[PDB]
mmCIF file of all heavy atoms in Angstrom:
data_model
loop_
_atom_site.group_PDB
_atom_site.id
_atom_site.type_symbol
_atom_site.label_atom_id
_atom_site.label_comp_id
_atom_site.label_asym_id
_atom_site.label_seq_id
_atom_site.Cartn_x
_atom_site.Cartn_y
_atom_site.Cartn_z
ATOM 1 N N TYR A 12 3.208 2.389 -21.688
ATOM 2 C CA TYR A 12 1.954 2.066 -21.021
ATOM 3 C C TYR A 12 0.796 2.069 -22.043
ATOM 4 O O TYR A 12 0.509 3.097 -22.680
ATOM 5 C CB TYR A 12 1.737 3.068 -19.869
ATOM 6 C CG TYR A 12 2.837 2.991 -18.815
ATOM 7 C CD1 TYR A 12 4.031 3.658 -18.978
ATOM 8 C CD2 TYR A 12 2.669 2.252 -17.637
ATOM 9 C CE1 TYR A 12 5.035 3.584 -18.043
ATOM 10 C CE2 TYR A 12 3.679 2.174 -16.700
ATOM 11 C CZ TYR A 12 4.851 2.834 -16.898
ATOM 12 O OH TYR A 12 5.860 2.776 -15.953
ATOM 13 N N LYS A 13 0.154 0.909 -22.211
ATOM 14 C CA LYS A 13 -0.938 0.747 -23.177
ATOM 15 C C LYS A 13 -2.309 0.559 -22.503
ATOM 16 O O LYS A 13 -2.458 -0.271 -21.623
ATOM 17 C CB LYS A 13 -0.631 -0.448 -24.102
ATOM 18 C CG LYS A 13 -1.667 -0.711 -25.188
ATOM 19 C CD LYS A 13 -1.409 -2.032 -25.910
ATOM 20 C CE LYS A 13 -0.024 -2.091 -26.547
ATOM 21 N NZ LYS A 13 0.178 -3.347 -27.321
ATOM 22 N N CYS A 14 -3.297 1.341 -22.931
ATOM 23 C CA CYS A 14 -4.682 1.209 -22.479
ATOM 24 C C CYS A 14 -5.583 0.660 -23.591
ATOM 25 O O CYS A 14 -5.635 1.235 -24.673
ATOM 26 C CB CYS A 14 -5.215 2.564 -22.011
ATOM 27 S SG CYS A 14 -6.947 2.542 -21.515
ATOM 28 N N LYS A 15 -6.291 -0.437 -23.319
ATOM 29 C CA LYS A 15 -7.224 -1.046 -24.286
ATOM 30 C C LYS A 15 -8.669 -0.932 -23.802
ATOM 31 O O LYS A 15 -8.989 -1.415 -22.727
ATOM 32 C CB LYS A 15 -6.871 -2.508 -24.491
ATOM 33 C CG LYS A 15 -7.759 -3.233 -25.495
ATOM 34 C CD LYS A 15 -7.499 -4.733 -25.507
ATOM 35 C CE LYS A 15 -6.059 -5.070 -25.853
ATOM 36 N NZ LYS A 15 -5.860 -6.538 -26.007
ATOM 37 N N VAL A 16 -9.521 -0.310 -24.609
ATOM 38 C CA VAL A 16 -10.893 0.005 -24.239
ATOM 39 C C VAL A 16 -11.855 -0.812 -25.116
ATOM 40 O O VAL A 16 -11.720 -0.810 -26.345
ATOM 41 C CB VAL A 16 -11.185 1.516 -24.402
ATOM 42 C CG1 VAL A 16 -12.631 1.828 -24.063
ATOM 43 C CG2 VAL A 16 -10.269 2.345 -23.513
ATOM 44 N N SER A 17 -12.786 -1.534 -24.487
ATOM 45 C CA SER A 17 -13.778 -2.365 -25.214
ATOM 46 C C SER A 17 -15.226 -1.918 -24.952
ATOM 47 O O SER A 17 -15.568 -1.561 -23.826
ATOM 48 C CB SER A 17 -13.637 -3.838 -24.822
ATOM 49 O OG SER A 17 -12.362 -4.354 -25.147
ATOM 50 N N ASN A 18 -16.069 -1.955 -25.988
ATOM 51 C CA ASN A 18 -17.455 -1.462 -25.930
ATOM 52 C C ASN A 18 -18.305 -1.910 -27.140
ATOM 53 O O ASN A 18 -17.809 -1.975 -28.272
ATOM 54 C CB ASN A 18 -17.480 0.057 -25.840
ATOM 55 C CG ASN A 18 -18.888 0.623 -25.821
ATOM 56 O OD1 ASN A 18 -19.401 1.078 -26.841
ATOM 57 N ND2 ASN A 18 -19.521 0.587 -24.656
ATOM 58 N N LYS A 19 -19.580 -2.212 -26.888
ATOM 59 C CA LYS A 19 -20.475 -2.758 -27.907
ATOM 60 C C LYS A 19 -20.695 -1.817 -29.085
ATOM 61 O O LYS A 19 -21.018 -2.263 -30.185
ATOM 62 C CB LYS A 19 -21.858 -3.038 -27.314
ATOM 63 C CG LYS A 19 -21.945 -4.080 -26.230
ATOM 64 C CD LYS A 19 -23.106 -3.719 -25.312
ATOM 65 C CE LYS A 19 -23.321 -4.728 -24.204
ATOM 66 N NZ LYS A 19 -24.290 -4.211 -23.198
ATOM 67 N N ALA A 20 -20.534 -0.517 -28.854
ATOM 68 C CA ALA A 20 -20.769 0.485 -29.898
ATOM 69 C C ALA A 20 -19.578 0.714 -30.822
ATOM 70 O O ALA A 20 -19.675 1.484 -31.780
ATOM 71 C CB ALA A 20 -21.181 1.807 -29.259
ATOM 72 N N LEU A 21 -18.456 0.065 -30.533
ATOM 73 C CA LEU A 21 -17.256 0.218 -31.349
ATOM 74 C C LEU A 21 -17.070 -1.006 -32.254
ATOM 75 O O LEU A 21 -17.408 -2.124 -31.853
ATOM 76 C CB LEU A 21 -16.028 0.441 -30.456
ATOM 77 C CG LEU A 21 -16.008 1.731 -29.619
ATOM 78 C CD1 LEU A 21 -14.923 1.653 -28.572
ATOM 79 C CD2 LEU A 21 -15.801 2.983 -30.484
ATOM 80 N N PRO A 22 -16.526 -0.804 -33.473
ATOM 81 C CA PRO A 22 -16.228 -1.929 -34.375
ATOM 82 C C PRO A 22 -15.159 -2.884 -33.832
ATOM 83 O O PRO A 22 -15.230 -4.095 -34.052
ATOM 84 C CB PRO A 22 -15.742 -1.234 -35.653
ATOM 85 C CG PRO A 22 -15.248 0.090 -35.209
ATOM 86 C CD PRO A 22 -16.104 0.487 -34.047
ATOM 87 N N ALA A 23 -14.166 -2.326 -33.145
ATOM 88 C CA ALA A 23 -13.088 -3.103 -32.542
ATOM 89 C C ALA A 23 -12.510 -2.310 -31.366
ATOM 90 O O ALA A 23 -12.714 -1.095 -31.283
ATOM 91 C CB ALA A 23 -12.021 -3.422 -33.577
ATOM 92 N N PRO A 24 -11.792 -2.984 -30.456
ATOM 93 C CA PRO A 24 -11.312 -2.252 -29.271
ATOM 94 C C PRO A 24 -10.348 -1.137 -29.660
ATOM 95 O O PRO A 24 -9.695 -1.240 -30.696
ATOM 96 C CB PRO A 24 -10.623 -3.340 -28.434
ATOM 97 C CG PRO A 24 -10.215 -4.370 -29.418
ATOM 98 C CD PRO A 24 -11.270 -4.365 -30.484
ATOM 99 N N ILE A 25 -10.304 -0.071 -28.868
ATOM 100 C CA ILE A 25 -9.379 1.029 -29.118
ATOM 101 C C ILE A 25 -8.137 0.870 -28.247
ATOM 102 O O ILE A 25 -8.245 0.637 -27.030
ATOM 103 C CB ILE A 25 -10.039 2.400 -28.831
ATOM 104 C CG1 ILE A 25 -11.177 2.657 -29.825
ATOM 105 C CG2 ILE A 25 -9.003 3.538 -28.844
ATOM 106 C CD1 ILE A 25 -12.267 3.583 -29.298
ATOM 107 N N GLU A 26 -6.964 1.015 -28.851
ATOM 108 C CA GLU A 26 -5.721 1.015 -28.087
ATOM 109 C C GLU A 26 -5.060 2.378 -28.150
ATOM 110 O O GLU A 26 -5.008 2.996 -29.207
ATOM 111 C CB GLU A 26 -4.735 -0.042 -28.598
ATOM 112 C CG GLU A 26 -5.026 -1.478 -28.191
ATOM 113 C CD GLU A 26 -3.950 -2.447 -28.692
ATOM 114 O OE1 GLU A 26 -2.988 -1.982 -29.341
ATOM 115 O OE2 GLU A 26 -4.047 -3.662 -28.401
ATOM 116 N N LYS A 27 -4.574 2.857 -27.006
ATOM 117 C CA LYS A 27 -3.718 4.041 -26.999
ATOM 118 C C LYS A 27 -2.470 3.725 -26.153
ATOM 119 O O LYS A 27 -2.568 3.048 -25.119
ATOM 120 C CB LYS A 27 -4.476 5.255 -26.447
ATOM 121 C CG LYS A 27 -5.742 5.633 -27.218
ATOM 122 C CD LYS A 27 -5.462 6.059 -28.647
ATOM 123 C CE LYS A 27 -6.749 6.368 -29.385
ATOM 124 N NZ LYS A 27 -6.518 6.622 -30.827
ATOM 125 N N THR A 28 -1.310 4.224 -26.571
ATOM 126 C CA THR A 28 -0.040 3.990 -25.856
ATOM 127 C C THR A 28 0.673 5.301 -25.550
ATOM 128 O O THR A 28 0.551 6.272 -26.296
ATOM 129 C CB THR A 28 0.899 3.075 -26.683
ATOM 130 O OG1 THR A 28 0.233 1.853 -26.985
ATOM 131 C CG2 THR A 28 2.174 2.752 -25.909
ATOM 132 N N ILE A 29 1.400 5.329 -24.434
ATOM 133 C CA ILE A 29 2.137 6.514 -24.021
ATOM 134 C C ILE A 29 3.429 6.145 -23.300
ATOM 135 O O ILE A 29 3.536 5.074 -22.692
ATOM 136 C CB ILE A 29 1.279 7.420 -23.104
ATOM 137 C CG1 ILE A 29 1.920 8.792 -22.969
ATOM 138 C CG2 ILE A 29 1.074 6.783 -21.695
ATOM 139 C CD1 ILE A 29 0.974 9.849 -22.442
ATOM 140 N N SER A 30 4.400 7.045 -23.371
ATOM 141 C CA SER A 30 5.674 6.893 -22.676
ATOM 142 C C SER A 30 6.384 8.232 -22.613
ATOM 143 O O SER A 30 5.990 9.175 -23.277
ATOM 144 C CB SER A 30 6.538 5.869 -23.384
ATOM 145 O OG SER A 30 6.793 6.330 -24.689
ATOM 146 N N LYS A 31 7.432 8.314 -21.817
ATOM 147 C CA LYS A 31 8.221 9.525 -21.709
ATOM 148 C C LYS A 31 8.898 9.839 -23.025
ATOM 149 O O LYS A 31 9.268 8.932 -23.747
ATOM 150 C CB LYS A 31 9.275 9.388 -20.628
ATOM 151 C CG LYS A 31 9.966 10.679 -20.316
ATOM 152 C CD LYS A 31 11.081 10.507 -19.302
ATOM 153 C CE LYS A 31 12.253 9.721 -19.898
ATOM 154 N NZ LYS A 31 13.560 10.169 -19.356
ATOM 155 N N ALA A 32 9.020 11.120 -23.334
ATOM 156 C CA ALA A 32 9.791 11.537 -24.516
ATOM 157 C C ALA A 32 11.195 10.908 -24.481
ATOM 158 O O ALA A 32 11.859 10.814 -23.470
ATOM 159 C CB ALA A 32 9.919 13.033 -24.596
ATOM 160 N N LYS A 33 11.601 10.475 -25.671
ATOM 161 C CA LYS A 33 12.897 9.838 -25.854
ATOM 162 C C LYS A 33 14.040 10.821 -26.075
ATOM 163 O O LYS A 33 13.866 11.862 -26.689
ATOM 164 C CB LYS A 33 12.809 8.877 -27.023
ATOM 165 C CG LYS A 33 11.781 7.746 -26.777
ATOM 166 C CD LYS A 33 11.767 6.711 -27.892
ATOM 167 C CE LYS A 33 11.072 5.428 -27.440
ATOM 168 N NZ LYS A 33 11.893 4.621 -26.485
ATOM 169 N N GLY A 34 15.213 10.482 -25.539
ATOM 170 C CA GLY A 34 16.414 11.254 -25.786
ATOM 171 C C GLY A 34 17.121 11.533 -24.452
ATOM 172 O O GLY A 34 16.526 11.505 -23.369
ATOM 173 N N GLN A 35 18.354 11.978 -24.600
ATOM 174 C CA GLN A 35 19.246 12.291 -23.500
ATOM 175 C C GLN A 35 18.693 13.454 -22.710
ATOM 176 O O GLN A 35 18.521 14.543 -23.247
ATOM 177 C CB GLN A 35 20.613 12.638 -24.115
ATOM 178 C CG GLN A 35 21.620 13.243 -23.209
ATOM 179 C CD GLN A 35 22.082 12.254 -22.222
ATOM 180 O OE1 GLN A 35 22.807 11.288 -22.572
ATOM 181 N NE2 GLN A 35 21.711 12.460 -20.971
ATOM 182 N N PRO A 36 18.464 13.249 -21.399
ATOM 183 C CA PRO A 36 17.996 14.405 -20.631
ATOM 184 C C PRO A 36 19.097 15.465 -20.529
ATOM 185 O O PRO A 36 20.284 15.171 -20.476
ATOM 186 C CB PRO A 36 17.595 13.789 -19.252
ATOM 187 C CG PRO A 36 17.237 12.360 -19.606
ATOM 188 C CD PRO A 36 18.251 11.970 -20.704
ATOM 189 N N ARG A 37 18.658 16.703 -20.503
ATOM 190 C CA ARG A 37 19.530 17.821 -20.370
ATOM 191 C C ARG A 37 19.114 18.719 -19.175
ATOM 192 O O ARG A 37 17.918 18.990 -18.957
ATOM 193 C CB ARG A 37 19.516 18.667 -21.631
ATOM 194 C CG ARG A 37 20.084 17.940 -22.855
ATOM 195 C CD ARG A 37 20.136 18.873 -24.086
ATOM 196 N NE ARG A 37 20.763 20.154 -23.723
ATOM 197 C CZ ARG A 37 21.009 21.158 -24.551
ATOM 198 N NH1 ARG A 37 20.740 21.053 -25.839
ATOM 199 N NH2 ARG A 37 21.563 22.265 -24.080
ATOM 200 N N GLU A 38 20.130 19.108 -18.400
ATOM 201 C CA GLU A 38 19.919 19.920 -17.181
ATOM 202 C C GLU A 38 19.406 21.336 -17.450
ATOM 203 O O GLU A 38 19.997 22.102 -18.225
ATOM 204 C CB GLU A 38 21.288 20.010 -16.456
ATOM 205 C CG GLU A 38 21.202 20.635 -15.138
ATOM 206 C CD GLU A 38 22.559 20.778 -14.486
ATOM 207 O OE1 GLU A 38 23.519 21.150 -15.177
ATOM 208 O OE2 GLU A 38 22.664 20.489 -13.293
ATOM 209 N N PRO A 39 18.307 21.731 -16.787
ATOM 210 C CA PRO A 39 17.931 23.144 -16.876
ATOM 211 C C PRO A 39 18.966 24.073 -16.274
ATOM 212 O O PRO A 39 19.612 23.797 -15.244
ATOM 213 C CB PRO A 39 16.638 23.239 -16.069
ATOM 214 C CG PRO A 39 16.490 21.984 -15.352
ATOM 215 C CD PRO A 39 17.383 20.949 -15.961
ATOM 216 N N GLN A 40 19.119 25.219 -16.905
ATOM 217 C CA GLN A 40 19.920 26.312 -16.338
ATOM 218 C C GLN A 40 18.932 27.378 -15.931
ATOM 219 O O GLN A 40 18.081 27.690 -16.748
ATOM 220 C CB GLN A 40 20.881 26.853 -17.363
ATOM 221 C CG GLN A 40 21.749 25.759 -17.976
ATOM 222 C CD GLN A 40 22.331 26.167 -19.294
ATOM 223 O OE1 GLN A 40 22.682 27.328 -19.500
ATOM 224 N NE2 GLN A 40 22.433 25.213 -20.209
ATOM 225 N N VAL A 41 19.076 27.925 -14.725
ATOM 226 C CA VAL A 41 18.051 28.749 -14.086
ATOM 227 C C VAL A 41 18.655 30.115 -13.744
ATOM 228 O O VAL A 41 19.717 30.186 -13.141
ATOM 229 C CB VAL A 41 17.552 28.083 -12.796
ATOM 230 C CG1 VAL A 41 16.454 28.889 -12.151
ATOM 231 C CG2 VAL A 41 17.092 26.648 -13.068
ATOM 232 N N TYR A 42 17.962 31.163 -14.150
ATOM 233 C CA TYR A 42 18.440 32.516 -14.017
ATOM 234 C C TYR A 42 17.294 33.393 -13.512
ATOM 235 O O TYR A 42 16.219 33.408 -14.079
ATOM 236 C CB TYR A 42 18.917 33.038 -15.360
ATOM 237 C CG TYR A 42 19.992 32.201 -15.966
ATOM 238 C CD1 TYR A 42 19.761 31.466 -17.122
ATOM 239 C CD2 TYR A 42 21.242 32.159 -15.385
ATOM 240 C CE1 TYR A 42 20.779 30.663 -17.672
ATOM 241 C CE2 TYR A 42 22.250 31.389 -15.925
ATOM 242 C CZ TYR A 42 22.012 30.645 -17.061
ATOM 243 O OH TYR A 42 23.053 29.874 -17.576
ATOM 244 N N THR A 43 17.561 34.144 -12.465
ATOM 245 C CA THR A 43 16.555 35.062 -11.975
ATOM 246 C C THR A 43 16.932 36.457 -12.469
ATOM 247 O O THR A 43 18.125 36.826 -12.511
ATOM 248 C CB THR A 43 16.443 35.025 -10.431
ATOM 249 O OG1 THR A 43 17.741 35.215 -9.856
ATOM 250 C CG2 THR A 43 15.892 33.656 -9.932
ATOM 251 N N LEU A 44 15.906 37.220 -12.846
ATOM 252 C CA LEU A 44 16.049 38.547 -13.395
ATOM 253 C C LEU A 44 15.106 39.454 -12.612
ATOM 254 O O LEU A 44 13.931 39.138 -12.451
ATOM 255 C CB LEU A 44 15.723 38.558 -14.899
ATOM 256 C CG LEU A 44 16.286 37.410 -15.704
ATOM 257 C CD1 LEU A 44 15.744 37.481 -17.087
ATOM 258 C CD2 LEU A 44 17.802 37.450 -15.757
ATOM 259 N N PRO A 45 15.616 40.580 -12.100
ATOM 260 C CA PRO A 45 14.765 41.478 -11.315
ATOM 261 C C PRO A 45 13.865 42.302 -12.214
ATOM 262 O O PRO A 45 14.023 42.269 -13.432
ATOM 263 C CB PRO A 45 15.778 42.383 -10.602
ATOM 264 C CG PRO A 45 16.909 42.464 -11.558
ATOM 265 C CD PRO A 45 17.001 41.073 -12.177
ATOM 266 N N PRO A 46 12.946 43.065 -11.623
ATOM 267 C CA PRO A 46 12.145 43.952 -12.480
ATOM 268 C C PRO A 46 12.972 44.994 -13.219
ATOM 269 O O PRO A 46 13.947 45.510 -12.669
ATOM 270 C CB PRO A 46 11.221 44.662 -11.486
ATOM 271 C CG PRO A 46 11.234 43.910 -10.255
ATOM 272 C CD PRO A 46 12.557 43.162 -10.209
ATOM 273 N N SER A 47 12.570 45.313 -14.444
ATOM 274 C CA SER A 47 12.993 46.557 -15.102
ATOM 275 C C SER A 47 12.747 47.773 -14.224
ATOM 276 O O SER A 47 11.693 47.880 -13.580
ATOM 277 C CB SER A 47 12.233 46.709 -16.413
ATOM 278 O OG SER A 47 12.415 47.990 -16.953
#
């Protein structure tokens, strides 16, 4: 997903891009621990 921002005070438009982290998803393992 790319966002392009334009404005008179900037030398040229600003672009920023984002996406989900890459790689094989891995399942959480969940453990409950009682109070000490």
Side-chain angles (χ1 to χ4, degrees):
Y12 298 83
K13 182 189 302 184
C14 177
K15 181 189 301 186
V16 178
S17 299
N18 178 261
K19 296 151 178 170
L21 296 167
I25 294 153
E26 283 183 0
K27 301 297 178 187
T28 304
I29 194 163
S30 61
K31 190 184 69 147
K33 298 185 163 287
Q35 169 69 71
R37 295 184 49 177
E38 188 183 42
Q40 306 159 36
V41 182
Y42 302 112
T43 53
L44 317 173
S47 169

